[PDB]
Enzyme design. Structure first.
Site, PDB file in Angstrom:
ATOM      1  N   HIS A   1       0.656  -1.047   0.076  1.00  0.00           N
ATOM      2  CA  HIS A   1       0.016  -0.167   0.082  1.00  0.00           C
ATOM      3  C   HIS A   1       0.905   1.310   0.055  1.00  0.00           C
ATOM      4  CE1 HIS A   1      -2.888  -2.877   1.954  1.00  0.00           C
ATOM      5  NE2 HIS A   1      -3.650  -2.464   0.797  1.00  0.00           N
TER       6      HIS A   1
ATOM      7  N   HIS B   1       5.261   6.594   7.040  1.00  0.00           N
ATOM      8  CA  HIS B   1       5.033   6.135   5.590  1.00  0.00           C
ATOM      9  C   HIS B   1       4.756   7.564   4.917  1.00  0.00           C
ATOM     10  CE1 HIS B   1       1.309   6.384   7.845  1.00  0.00           C
ATOM     11  NE2 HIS B   1       0.844   6.762   6.316  1.00  0.00           N
TER      12      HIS B   1
ATOM     13  N   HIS C   1       2.585   9.102   1.067  1.00  0.00           N
ATOM     14  CA  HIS C   1       1.352   8.967   0.049  1.00  0.00           C
ATOM     15  C   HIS C   1       1.808   9.888  -0.914  1.00  0.00           C
ATOM     16  CE1 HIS C   1      -1.378   7.261   3.354  1.00  0.00           C
ATOM     17  NE2 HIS C   1      -0.944   8.048   4.079  1.00  0.00           N
TER      18      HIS C   1
ATOM     19  N   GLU D   1      -2.497  14.096   1.213  1.00  0.00           N
ATOM     20  CA  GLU D   1      -3.750  13.367   1.470  1.00  0.00           C
ATOM     21  C   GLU D   1      -4.675  14.913   1.947  1.00  0.00           C
ATOM     22  OE1 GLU D   1      -3.489   9.748   4.250  1.00  0.00           O
ATOM     23  OE2 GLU D   1      -4.477   9.338   2.270  1.00  0.00           O
TER      24      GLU D   1
ATOM     25  N   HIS E   1       3.636  10.881   7.062  1.00  0.00           N
ATOM     26  CA  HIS E   1       3.207  10.683   8.210  1.00  0.00           C
ATOM     27  C   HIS E   1       3.957   9.831   9.191  1.00  0.00           C
ATOM     28  CE1 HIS E   1      -1.175  10.959   6.063  1.00  0.00           C
ATOM     29  NE2 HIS E   1      -0.543  12.185   6.249  1.00  0.00           N
TER      30      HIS E   1
ATOM     31  N   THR F   1      -6.467   7.274   7.772  1.00  0.00           N
ATOM     32  CA  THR F   1      -6.912   7.435   6.399  1.00  0.00           C
ATOM     33  C   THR F   1      -6.635   6.060   5.440  1.00  0.00           C
ATOM     34  OG1 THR F   1      -4.782   8.224   5.547  1.00  0.00           O
ATOM     35  CG2 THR F   1      -5.876  10.052   6.532  1.00  0.00           C
ATOM     36  N   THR F   2      -6.723   4.922   6.063  1.00  0.00           N
ATOM     37  CA  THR F   2      -6.646   3.785   5.381  1.00  0.00           C
ATOM     38  C   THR F   2      -7.609   2.965   6.279  1.00  0.00           C
ATOM     39  OG1 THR F   2      -4.669   3.031   6.364  1.00  0.00           O
ATOM     40  CG2 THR F   2      -4.391   3.714   4.525  1.00  0.00           C
TER      41      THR F   2
END
Ligand SMILES: CCOc1c(F)c(S(N)(=O)=O)c(F)c(NC2CCCCCCC2)c1S(=O)(=O)CCCO
Ligand SMILES: CCOc1c(F)c(S(N)(=O)=O)c(F)c(NC2CCCCCCC2)c1S(=O)(=O)CCCO
Ligand SMILES: [Zn+2]
Ligand SMILES: [Zn+2]
Lengths: 260, 260
Positions: free
Chosen positions: B64, B89, B91, B102, B115, B196-197
């Site tokens: 992911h 991690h 995005h 995000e 994040h 957010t996941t």
């Protein structure tokens, strides 16, 4: 069965309306990276938009927005079939955050958005039949910003107190629907997308005009405060605010513009 | 089981992960109508962030994102509880539309977002236990803009071409994680939200720093092009792109700012 807020809101639409988690979803953010000029796009023509003042047209609160029924003589020319008015409706925000358009332009919401819904009258007998079939629908989107009082939009707004609750209906005398459109309709964004509400069918050809119209701060407040999503006699009345869908992912695809 | 694109994408997460359709969902658009200055918001302190150069930390492609494991030695001080690090991690978007943060600010995406995830170690034994519990999690978010090369981010990104496929791992020598934070960390947005996941638990105290960092065009393209969501032996590879959630509705609520 569906709402724009809370448990039955847009993240849960896909449960009972699969297509809401499917392909070609609308609305979207219109931004430079995904635009491409198409010199072959043509201005639309609005034939039969000037409705007779001696005729009346039904305004309905359907629990999700206010819609005005429109006659099938009202139609266009500029697509690859004939596309025929069925209804128009609006989307808006709330007084604390008066930014409730569906489409955004370079990440910016507008105050509200008007949609003029047509159907493919060449392939299908009516709008409901067309709705879940190839090439069914075509929707015109007018972005609305706060500014000067708009007498044409007041031809709708002045009736809102007669459709306060879900299921209420009232008649509006005909007026010139073309007066709700902006300047230079020739400049627009065009893309293949979906209904922005359940059932989310991916069968709409969107045309979003480049230029917004204005309504006054007072008109916008009136719209945001006039209506309820619930029926008379409902034990928990709910005011009709923030009736817009969030923008969707839009990847490996293009929006075509009629302007460079 | 979940993705950012297609039938297992974000409009469907609620069908497997009920909290993704629930309250307090992240991310959001940070815009003036929902902001309020809170002068009581004091600077966080980042304790133990200077990881030993003599230690190595595990970098994993989890299918992911790319995540770096962090030690509980790392603490945020300044909240009601101490929160201890678990992982960081990122995005990001894709080369044709390199705008995959995000959170958005005044409707604008940034190129990417970092994040740093922490858990309430005063109340809970570990991050998994905390993740579905009251005051469980705190995440620091850094907005990333394309511009100048960033040596500190390169301490992670130099390993990307060696964790290209799902499940692959690399070791990153310890460095000062505070170098990944922007200027004026005292200036931030603060709100209560969610993962957010999936599973989207509404247990996150978000701190989004006001100021972005910059990474180079080459760094950003490496991030966007190096990684796949699929295993190395997979005959049909899927690129790891556009691994960000759309912004969520945010109504009757405020984001507090430590800047005016
Ligand atoms: C809250 C407004 O709802 C929309 C709407 F958002 C759109 S949009 N934004 O143009 O995609 C609509 F097109 C409609 N009406 C359509 C009428 C034509 C076909 C009949 C099925 C309903 C779709 C309607 S609606 O008819 O008002 C409600 C339809 C529920 O299925
Ligand atoms: C694509 C990155 O995924 C996120 C993620 F986006 C966020 S975020 N944006 O900070 O909300 C995460 F916090 C995490 N990891 C958390 C670790 C601590 C608690 C255990 C449950 C997972 C959440 C993770 S993740 O661990 O990488 C995958 C979590 C699947 O449940
Ligand atoms: Zn609409
Ligand atoms: Zn994250």
């Amino acid at each position: 069965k569906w709402t724009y807020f809370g448990p039955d809101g847009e993240n849960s639409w896909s449960k009972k309306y699969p297509s809401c988690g499917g392909l070609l979803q609308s609305p979207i953010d219109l931004h430079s990276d995904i635009l491409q000029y198409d010199a072959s796009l043509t201005p639309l023509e609005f034939q039969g938009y000037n409705l007779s003042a001696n005729k009346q047209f039904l305004l309905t609160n359907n629990g999700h927005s206010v819609k005005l029924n429109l006659p099938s003589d009202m139609h266009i020319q500029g697509l690859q079939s004939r596309y025929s008015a069925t209804q128009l409706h609006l989307h808006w925000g709330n007084p604390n955050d008066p930014h409730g358009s569906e489409h955004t332009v370079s990440g910016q919401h507008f105050a509200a958005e008007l949609h003029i819904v047509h159907y493919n009258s060449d392939l299908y007998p009516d709008a409901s039949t067309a709705s879940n079939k190839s090439e069914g629908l075509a929707v015109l989107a007018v972005l609305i910003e706060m500014g000067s009082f708009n007498p044409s939009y007041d031809k709708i707004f002045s009736h809102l107190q007669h459709v306060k609750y879900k299921g209420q209906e009232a008649f509006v005398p005909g007026f010139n629907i073309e007066e709700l459109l902006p300047e230079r309709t020739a400049e627009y964004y065009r893309y293949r997308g979906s209904l922005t509400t359940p059932p989310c069918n991916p069968t709409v050809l969107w045309t979003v005009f480049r230029n917004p119209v204005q309504i006054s701060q007072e008109q916008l407040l009136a719209l945001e405060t006039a209506l309820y999503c619930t029926h008379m006699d409902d034990p928990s009345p709910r005011e009709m605010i923030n009736n817009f869908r969030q923008v969707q992912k839009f990847d490996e695809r293009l929006v075509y513009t009629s302007f460079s």
